Write a protein that binds this DNA or RNA. Structure first.
Lengths: 155, 51, 118, 123
RNA sequence: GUUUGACCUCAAAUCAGGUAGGAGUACCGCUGAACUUAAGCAUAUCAAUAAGCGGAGGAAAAGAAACCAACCGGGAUUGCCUUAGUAACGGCGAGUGAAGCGGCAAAAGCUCAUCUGGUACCUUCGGUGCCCGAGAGGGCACUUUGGGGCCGUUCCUUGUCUAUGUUCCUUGGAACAGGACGUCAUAGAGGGUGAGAAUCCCGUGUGGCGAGGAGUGCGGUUCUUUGUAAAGUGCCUUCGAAGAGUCGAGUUGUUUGGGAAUGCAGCUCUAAGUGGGUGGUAAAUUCCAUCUAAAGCUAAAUAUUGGCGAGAGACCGAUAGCGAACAAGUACAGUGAUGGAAAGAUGAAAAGAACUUUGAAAAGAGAGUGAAAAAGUACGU
RNA sequence: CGUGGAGGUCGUGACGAAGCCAGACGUAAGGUCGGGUCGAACGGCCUCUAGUGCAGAUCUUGGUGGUAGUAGCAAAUAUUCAAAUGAGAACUUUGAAGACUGAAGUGGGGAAAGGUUCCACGUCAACAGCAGUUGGACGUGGGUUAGUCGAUCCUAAGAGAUGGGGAAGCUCCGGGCCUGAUUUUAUGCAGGCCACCAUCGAAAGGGAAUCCGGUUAAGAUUCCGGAACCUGG
């Protein structure tokens, strides 16, 4: 009976949490603190062209993470995938995977389908960013690639 | 006469005796799963054929 | 063997003759009792004895349905049509009849439906 | 889970319950065994249900490397018996050894009238 | 004085036609408790609860104002929201406990006060052919003035397809490992598979494609009757279809937040007819402000400790979760109502222990199978 | 500090969890590893949540020790002795010899009830408070034959269908029969009577008729061989 099991959020708390989380992708020390592998940069975040919506396949998506040395982060989820204990194994929780790239897109239409296939990737739009995207596990400083139109929208 | 003569009743008590019989070897053999102890088994002194 | 399709092609006289052979043949399978066997013909004869009774019942329904389409009839066909009391309750039918006439007409009028319509 | 929408399925709890107990057909989907490469090219499917007149190669078992005609498929707990693919009792009589169809790959098939027509449809 | 044929009222039969009784889990209308609370108790509370009874549907029930009102405006009815622990009740103790509004979900206004049966005919929710029984007004300028069929699409059902490694070495009984090499992904959800698999298989995927169906509305096409009367706009008077043991009263109840002022029952008594009712005690007036009961219908939005299908999950994981993971409402107890358990697991493969010695038989010995028998049958640990 | 689960982070794994002995500490909650078992999964950290830690509650449930090889297997005194059979015999069976039962502390035949226990055969794990070749265990077949027995029929103490009336309601009290034209097929037109009305209720009230013996492994006044009789229409 009964238990709520809904926590209300304060708008003011929540905005602060999102903004700080985005900002955490800016300071590198905090990204490194979270457990991100990252090099070539760690000038941070990456801004990529508005042409990236028009990425159809997966061959381009894996390739694209290669140039900013960021493919390394892709490697990290490709292995090291924990075979969970528990009841979750009955459900669908059997593997838990590490959270790698985030790519955030500007377009109303929906997330970049291509970029979604990478192991441990999540894809989002700026309109529908949340705390979880920028900081999975509430540990901030996830590696992201922001589209330029995404970047203006972020503001 | 006797006993208990009612035709309808007689049949039910008779029908029941056959229904309480041992299994056929085969169902153990093509087999489902079951240490197959029938269960329905009804008994000489003991229990009661049913009130 | 017996297939459903063969029984339909056969006549009302011919299927009756089949039912007669079938009972004889089932009767011989009674006699062949001392063994066990004898049945892969009785299970299938049981199915055959059912098929021949069905096929005749179906022939008589269809023939009846033709004869009666011309006239008036139908307690028996009525039972198939409703498929009882609830689906019957959902009838009379009520729907077109209910708005069969008052005040709709006034309300409106349509050159208008067309005119707009593209 | 995935293609999460308003639909019937996902669903490990059901999937297991479903595939294990199986109606006769989910044992049909189970009837499918991967084709050999010559067949994959002509017919244009990875796997199709395997036949009695077909010839089948064993991949998985110790049995592997052996070929024979498929004697039966026992639908109900989904398994296939292959001819000469037998195991031996103590008494010394030999009775067949059940195989999962995933284990085998189907070397040759008998085309069939409907099954060829549907195979052509699959293509 | 007396009968006979015929008219209508009541009755009984009869066969026909038409429908109901019963049922499914809860949801959904009445009659009506208690312990319990107030640390007692009797009003109050529990509670208009539970129960019992009646009965309907896929939702039900309610509905276009004799409303709201405390102003000046709103404008049918549910539900949601909150009004508010406010008003109000109450040993004014304990407790009890709204509405109007505001705005949402969703919207819709109308309708009362020739029909049927028989037989015939057809393309049988119909009509024709026959026979039989039973908001209103005047005259003028006009403008507005139909349905049916067909196909496609709308929505439901169903089937089919359909990416990419099964490579090397090593370990192993087995690679689904490591290291090495390589591939797809619009499919890195999940399952199976001799181990820990995107690429073996199922599937999977923003997935595509084919067929079948009631019912409707959008679009396209196609048939065809006259008309008449309705309706708008404007002039003229005018006005009924507007519901009685009702409205209202007392005296007796019970119910409610309802308090002189909730709603309902009972007994008694009892109006008017554009007159009447309401506006939170009762009584003159003009008038204000609102509305016409004693009648009815009605889509949609809400419920469903769920019959029927499916998803989901920091749920549980075999003394837990259902009573029930299997033969479970089984086995079994009780005269009956009713009560009610324990109950899963060999192995990659049955390869599920030949043959022999010994034995009454049960069994043991050796031996065989397997990576493993202290893996040998209620057999994982 | 420790627990199950979630997510993220750090990883770990075909010999993991789990187990028991030990080995190292942390006062301590616990902690870590090893033997040698086991043959698939598990930690840490951060953050969280909760079917979150037990000796106990005449606590729940299961299992187990002592109590014990202990009480009971004792009042009809009933067997004994050859022998049959069997792998096995105090209790199965044969004989002999002996008692006991006696309106039935053990005859005959049935009513209720049981529900196949009957009969045959073959087993002995389980049962019979012990053996057990035995049995009524178990398993596997088989057996019950009705015009004349009895139910059916009747009506009885009343279950009471059954106006009307309370109660929403559940619930509860208080014409039918016989024909005549035809015609012998029963079609068919037409006429005439009469009181307090249904069914059920006793397998032991009352009541239409059957005995004699013969046969079966197991039926019998049923079947049969003879003989008889009844009931209806």
């Amino acid at each position: 009976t009964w238990r709520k099991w809904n926590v209300k959020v304060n708008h003011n708390e929540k905005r602060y949490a999102t903004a700080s989380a985005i900002a955490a992708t800016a300071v590198a020390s905090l990204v490194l603190a979270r457990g991100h592998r990252v090099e070539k940069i760690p000038e941070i975040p990456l801004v990529v062209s508005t042409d990236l919506e028009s990425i159809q396949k997966t061959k381009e998506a894996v390739a694209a993470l290669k140039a900013v040395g960021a493919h390394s982060d892709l490697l990290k989820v490709l292995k090291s995938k924990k075979l969970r204990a528990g009841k979750g194994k009955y459900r669908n929780r059997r593997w838990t995977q590490r959270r790698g790239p985030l790519v955030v897109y500007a377009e109303d239409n929906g997330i970049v389908k291509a970029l979604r296939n990478v192991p441990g990737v999540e894809t989002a739009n700026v309109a529908s960013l949340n705390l979880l995207q920028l900081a999975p596990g509430a540990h901030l400083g996830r590696f992201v690639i922001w589209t330029e139109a995404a970047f203006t929208k972020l503001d | 006469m006797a006993a208990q003569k009612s035709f309808r009743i007689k049949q039910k008590m008779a029908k029941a005796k056959k229904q309480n019989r041992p299994l056929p070897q085969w169902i153990r053999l093509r087999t489902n799963n079951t240490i197959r102890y029938n269960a329905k088994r009804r008994n000489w002194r003991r229990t009661k054929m049913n009130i | 063997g017996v297939k459903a399709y063969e029984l339909r092609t056969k006549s009302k006289e011919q299927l009756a003759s089949q039912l007669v052979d079938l009972k004889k043949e089932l009767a011989e399978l009674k006699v062949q009792k001392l063994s066990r066997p004898s049945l892969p013909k009785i299970k299938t004869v049981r199915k055959s004895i059912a098929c021949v009774l069905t096929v005749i019942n179906e022939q008589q329904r269809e023939a009846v349905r033709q004869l009666y389409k011309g006239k008036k009839y139908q307690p028996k066909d009525l039972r198939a049509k409703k498929t009882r009391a609830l689906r019957r309750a959902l009838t009379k039918f009520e729907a077109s009849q209910v708005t069969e006439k008052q005040r709709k007409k006034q309300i409106a009028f349509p050159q208008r439906k067309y005119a707009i319509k593209a | 889970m995935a293609k999460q929408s308003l639909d019937v399925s996902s669903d490990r709890r059901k999937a297991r319950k479903a595939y294990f107990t199986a109606p006769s057909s989910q044992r049909r989907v189970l009837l499918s065994a991967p084709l050999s490469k010559e067949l994959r090219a002509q017919y244009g499917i990875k796997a199709l249900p395997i036949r009695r007149d077909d010839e089948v190669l064993v991949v998985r078992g110790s049995k592997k490397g052996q070929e024979g005609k498929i004697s039966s498929v026992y639908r109900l707990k989904f398994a296939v018996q292959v001819d000469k693919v037998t195991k031996e009792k103590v008494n010394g009589a030999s009775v067949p050894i059940n195989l999962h169809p995933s284990k085998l790959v189907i070397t040759k098939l008998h085309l069939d009238k409907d099954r060829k027509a549907l195979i052509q449809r699959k293509g």
